[PDB]
Amino acid sequence: GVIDTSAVESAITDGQGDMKAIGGYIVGALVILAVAGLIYSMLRKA
Amino acid sequence: GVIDTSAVESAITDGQGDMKAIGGYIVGALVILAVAGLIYSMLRKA
Amino acid sequence: GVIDTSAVESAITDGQGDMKAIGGYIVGALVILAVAGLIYSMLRKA
Amino acid sequence: GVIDTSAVESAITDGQGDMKAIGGYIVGALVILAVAGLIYSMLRKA
Amino acid sequence: GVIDTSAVESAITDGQGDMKAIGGYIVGALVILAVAGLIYSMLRKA
Amino acid sequence: GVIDTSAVESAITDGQGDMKAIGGYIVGALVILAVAGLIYSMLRKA
Amino acid sequence: GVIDTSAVESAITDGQGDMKAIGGYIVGALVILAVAGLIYSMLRKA
Amino acid sequence: GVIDTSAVESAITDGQGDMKAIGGYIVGALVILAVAGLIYSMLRKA
Amino acid sequence: GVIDTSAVESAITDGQGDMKAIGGYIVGALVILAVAGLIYSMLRKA
Amino acid sequence: GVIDTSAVESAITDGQGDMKAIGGYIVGALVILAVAGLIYSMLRKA
Amino acid sequence: GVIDTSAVESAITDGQGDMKAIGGYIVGALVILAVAGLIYSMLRKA
Amino acid sequence: GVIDTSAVESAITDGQGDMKAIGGYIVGALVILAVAGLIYSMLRKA
Amino acid sequence: GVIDTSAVESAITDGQGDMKAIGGYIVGALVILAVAGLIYSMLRKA
Amino acid sequence: GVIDTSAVESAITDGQGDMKAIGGYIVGALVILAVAGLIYSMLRKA
Amino acid sequence: GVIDTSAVESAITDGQGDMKAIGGYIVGALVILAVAGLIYSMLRKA
Amino acid sequence: GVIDTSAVESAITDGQGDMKAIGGYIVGALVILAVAGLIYSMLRKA
Amino acid sequence: GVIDTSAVESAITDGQGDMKAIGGYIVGALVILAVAGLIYSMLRKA
Amino acid sequence: GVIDTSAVESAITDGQGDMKAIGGYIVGALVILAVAGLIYSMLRKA
Amino acid sequence: GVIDTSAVESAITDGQGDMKAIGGYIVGALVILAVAGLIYSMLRKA
Amino acid sequence: GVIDTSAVESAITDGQGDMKAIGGYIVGALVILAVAGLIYSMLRKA
Amino acid sequence: GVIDTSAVESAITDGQGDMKAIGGYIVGALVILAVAGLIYSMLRKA
Amino acid sequence: GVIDTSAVESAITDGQGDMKAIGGYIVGALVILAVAGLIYSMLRKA
Amino acid sequence: GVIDTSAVESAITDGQGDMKAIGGYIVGALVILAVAGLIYSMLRKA
Amino acid sequence: GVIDTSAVESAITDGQGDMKAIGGYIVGALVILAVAGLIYSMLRKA
Amino acid sequence: GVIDTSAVESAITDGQGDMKAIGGYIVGALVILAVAGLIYSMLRKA
Amino acid sequence: GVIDTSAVESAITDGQGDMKAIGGYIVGALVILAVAGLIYSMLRKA
Amino acid sequence: GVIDTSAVESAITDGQGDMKAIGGYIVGALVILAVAGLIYSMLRKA
Amino acid sequence: GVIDTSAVESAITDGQGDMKAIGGYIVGALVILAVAGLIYSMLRKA
Amino acid sequence: GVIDTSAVESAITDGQGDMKAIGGYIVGALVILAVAGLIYSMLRKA
Amino acid sequence: GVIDTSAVESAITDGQGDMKAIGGYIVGALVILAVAGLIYSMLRKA
Amino acid sequence: GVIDTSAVESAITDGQGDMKAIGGYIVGALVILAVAGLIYSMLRKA
Amino acid sequence: GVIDTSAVESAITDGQGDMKAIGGYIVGALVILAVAGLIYSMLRKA
Amino acid sequence: GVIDTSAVESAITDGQGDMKAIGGYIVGALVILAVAGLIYSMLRKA
Amino acid sequence: GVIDTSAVESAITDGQGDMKAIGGYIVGALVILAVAGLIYSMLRKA
Amino acid sequence: GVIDTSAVESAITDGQGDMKAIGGYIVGALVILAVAGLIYSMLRKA
């Protein structure tokens, strides 16, 4: 039904709305991994 | 009878009137299924 | 009946009309998944 | 009666005439389902 | 029947009401999977 | 129905038409990954 | 009836006639998926 | 859907748009590693 | 009547005679479905 | 029906006949991947 | 009728007689899928 | 679900919260490696 | 059913309850890997 | 009859009364399936 | 029937009773996989 | 006749008396189907 | 009839009696599938 | 008539006598379907 | 039927009888993959 | 079925019974890799 | 379908046709890495 | 089917038959890598 | 399952129990390398 | 995500911010090595 | 896709285009090291 | 399968059987490197 | 497929065919390094 | 997990705890080298 | 990335910019060594 | 596996067992270098 | 790829082409060192 | 991590703190060499 | 594979076969250095 | 591991234990050089 | 490998076997230097 389907987009908004958030928030943790990684290499080096 | 049959359309209106509603309302539940489904995949991912 | 069946195409239009929309709108969420996915790989990388 | 039965074929023509139409028109909606389906898979993929 | 169908929405509310809950509650477990997963990678790393 | 099925190829054209595009467009991002990757190695090197 | 059933094979010819076409035409889209897939792997590689 | 897929390129632009940035920005750190590395060698030397 | 019933077997022969044909002829279409189906899987695969 | 089923093997022959071909032909592309891969390693090496 | 039912087993023999054949013959195609599948993995590997 | 996803950030906080710690704590050990390394070189020297 | 679904959370508690445990307990083994790894490097060094 | 039909609701109460029970009780078994399922994934993981 | 349905729970008990067992017992095999897996990594390492 | 009809209820009691039994007893067999069904799924799973 | 219906339970006993057997016996084959499945994974692994 | 009705049981014996046979004999064909079905799954698997 | 079902176990024996064989025989190929894999690593090594 | 499921543990015993063996036996080969590896380093050294 | 599958080889030609190119073209960059690498060593040397 | 499955081993023979070959043949290339590698070290040396 | 997971820790104990051992035991060999290394330097020296 | 990636540069700033520091600070120690080295040579000399 | 892959060469041009530059530019620094090195030796000498 | 897995050890024997050989045989070449290395030092010396 | 795999050896020939060449050709450059190296030592000497 | 990660620091303490020890203990041997070295020079001298 | 790499030259300028300085500045100390050295010889002389 | 890992120590014994030997045996050659070196100095001297 | 590898020799020509030059050109500076060295000795002498 | 890196400077302080000490302390021994050296020359002289 | 590995020894023979040659041939040049060195000392002497 | 590292000190004791010995024992030979040197000077003298 | 390492001692025998020879043979030339040196002094003398 028309009205019914409108409500679909709605929750699907949240869907994408929650996803840009979660996935983006995971990167916060990969950077930490990454940087902590370049120091490991400065010490190995000098 | 003419009059009698008119009354048919009437309840059949409800019929369709109740159906667009119920079936449409079930989708409300399939979207929840669907979205809760894409998050499961963001986590699996990151 | 002829007239009656015409009305069929009508709601079936909505049907397809609602479907190109919903399914297309779901992709909006798969791209988010996808892109958030390539960054995960730039960090893993550098 | 002969004449009477001729009139049968007539409405039965419509019958088939309305059916090739409706059923064929439903496919219009299954293709949409199908294609929207292969994109879902390009994104999952890349 | 009108009254009868009203009662439909009701239990269907629970339906969606129980689903947002369960599915959402499962994620609680995927995050645990996910995080326990990034540590595995800090150790592999350093 | 014949006519009906013709319309199938049509949307399936888009299907492939959208796919060569999307998937091809994703590579645009893998090259960036790749090249940014060879520099990382020139620096590691010298 | 004999004559009547002959006409069956006829439309069933179309049936198979439309199916070898559609299904075969879908593959056109899976190859695109496939090939676009091996490049993704050349870049990942080098 | 056509319109829907257009929106794909969009976020994929960001994808590549964020990647040239991040990966390029990581090099900023590898050069520091590199140069700090040639001095270590001037001192070892003289 | 004896003679009358003999004529029964006759048309019933056609009956079975038309049925082995039609049903057998439908399979012609299920194989097409089936095979077109295994290719879909070779591509998914490689 | 006997005759009808014979025709099954036929198209199923093609099925396997097309599959040994496609899948075998995909390998043609994996070898290219593979070899181009060992050179990458001779250069990394010397 | 006794005699009549005997004739049942007969065609049902074919039934099973055609089925062990068809289904068994389909496997011929799944093995091809399978083996072509392990090579894909030797190349990925070396 | 909204509420459910909030709880995601939470554990992901720990994730990053545990990672800055572990990885940072590993460096404590690389410095020891490093310094113990420069003495080795003072003795080699004088 | 309401009551029935309550019992869901319960076992799902265990689920997460067993997972934080197992995954956390695996790390116990990655640290051993890690540390035994830094000694290998002190010896290589001196 | 009025009285007679009253007795209908009665057994239909049981009907629903037995169904919320059985179906709800089946879930007890799907959760077990589900949870036993997330552990399988913690081990695959670490 | 009331009595009849009681007997349902019974076998459904076994159902869950057999499932916690089987699935739990499969893990016994995934741990073996897992541990045998960390040794592979100690050797690769030293 | 009054007396005569009384005897009706009697056998109709058996009727319902035999039916709650038979139908209830058939379920005994559907549960077996059902449970044997969830195990099939634990194995498919692990 | 009373006596007649008793005989019902009888064959229905067989029914369930044959079903616990068949379905249970099928599992014998799913375990084989399952186990042969974990070895495939030990080899993939080491 | 008494004698006449005795003869009823007789042919009804055949009835059941032919039915246990036919229906039982059909299963012969469902097993073939079933088993040919588990192999399809061993190949899909390995 | 009793006799009929006995014949079930029979073909199901083959089923499992063919499966232990096929799946076991596939491993023959995974070992080859595996071993050819450890040599690749002796050469990479020395 | 109870009895049927008992037989599950049985083959699953083999499963784990074959796995501790295979995986353990692979290590036999990684040690060879490892040791042959430390000699390579004594020679490089002296 | 025969014709349909022919078209497969076609795009798969491109696939390999694009891959020999890309991968080969990446080497162009590894040689640059390599040579720029031997000069670094002539200077270190003299 | 028995006969059908025999044919399985057959192609699986090729499978392993082609794999010992390919993988073994790849080593031919790793030795070249390896040896060309020890000369690089004689020159570096003297 | 609770009990089942307890058994996890168990084998994971061995895991770590075997790892502290192996990795620690490898060092036994690196010291030999190391010391044999300082003598090489006393002789070079005097 | 845009916002998310901004935060990347941030920690990567620290990364480089910590590296110019550490590596630069190590030189402080190489100069000490160096100078203490030229005195050793004045004494050797006079 | 053809067009898409063309764009690959493009960025890969930059890749090599940036690499000949960087690596070549590093040498600028090794010469400085080198020459400053021969003077150190003229003074040591006279 | 039991028998099937026995055959595993077999090829894994070769695996280790080929590895002790290859790796051991490589040392033959490192000794040559080594000795040719001590002469270089006798000449440098006298 | 047999034919398909033959074509594997082919490109793998090139692989080794290109590798003996490249790696061998790199040595051409290490000798130059080496010899230019012994002159440096004749001058240092006299 | 929080608790789990605490245990990380612990073994990492040992790690550093064992390293300051080993590396420091190696110096004990470099001093011996060093001093035994200055006497060699007093004798060369007088 | 183009812009990113430009920034490389920059810090590499410093690199060479700091090196001509340091190494040149060390000579300041070798001259002192040298001259203080010729006086030692005038006194030895007269 | 316990037993499996025991066998590890074994070959690792050889490892160290072969290393004390080789490295120790190399010294045999450094002494020759050394002594032949002190005579060179007696002659230079007298 | 054949063509691609040809281009390898090319840049490797430069490699050697630049090396004979640089290294040879460094000698120009060692002779200056050398000769300026023999005069130092004529003066010391007379 | 910021805090973590601070701790770096700390131990690096010791590093330099131990080095100025050791190297400076070695000179104590070179002076002894030196002076004991000028007396040798007063006696040679008178 | 057995046969495949035999071919390993072969090229490894060349490896050692080329190495005894090259390294031995380099000595030819160190002797020249050496002898030309003793004459330098006869002239210095007389 | 704690225990494992203890064993390190042990062999390192030998290390220093063998070094004080060897180096000290070499001096035995430098004194001989030295004294035999002062006699050469008594004879030159008288 | 045991056997493999035995072969080590072998070539190392030559190593020492060639060294006692070469170095000893060089002395032959230092004596000539030495004696030719004492005559120079008899003539200077008388």
UniProtKB/Swiss-Prot annotation, chains A, B, C, D, E, F, G, H, I, J, K, L, M, N, O, P, Q, R, S, T, U, V, W, X, Y, Z, AA, AB, AC, AD, AE, AF, AG, AH, AI:
Keywords assigned by UniProt, alphabetized: Capsid protein, Helical capsid protein, Host membrane, Membrane, Signal, Transmembrane, Transmembrane helix, Virion
Record's bilayer topology term: Single-pass type I membrane protein
S-S bridge residues: none
Cytoplasmic compartment spans: 43-46
Protein's cellular compartments: Virion; Host membrane
Periplasmic side: 1-21
Predominant cellular place of this UniProt entry's protein: virion
Single GO cellular component term: membrane
Transmembrane segments: 22-42
General function of this protein: Self assembles to form a helical capsid wrapping up the viral genomic DNA. The capsid displays a filamentous structure with a length of 760-1950 nm and a width of 6-8 nm. The virion assembly and budding take place at the host inner membrane.
Protein family: Belongs to the inovirus capsid protein family.
Assembly mode: Homomultimerizes. There are several thousands of this protein in the phage capsid.
Name of the molecule in the record: Capsid protein G8P
Organism whose genome encodes this protein: Pseudomonas phage Pf1 (Bacteriophage Pf1)
Organism ancestry: Viruses, Monodnaviria, Loebvirae, Hofneiviricota, Faserviricetes
Gene that specifies this protein: VIII
Residues of the full protein shown: 37 to 82 of 82
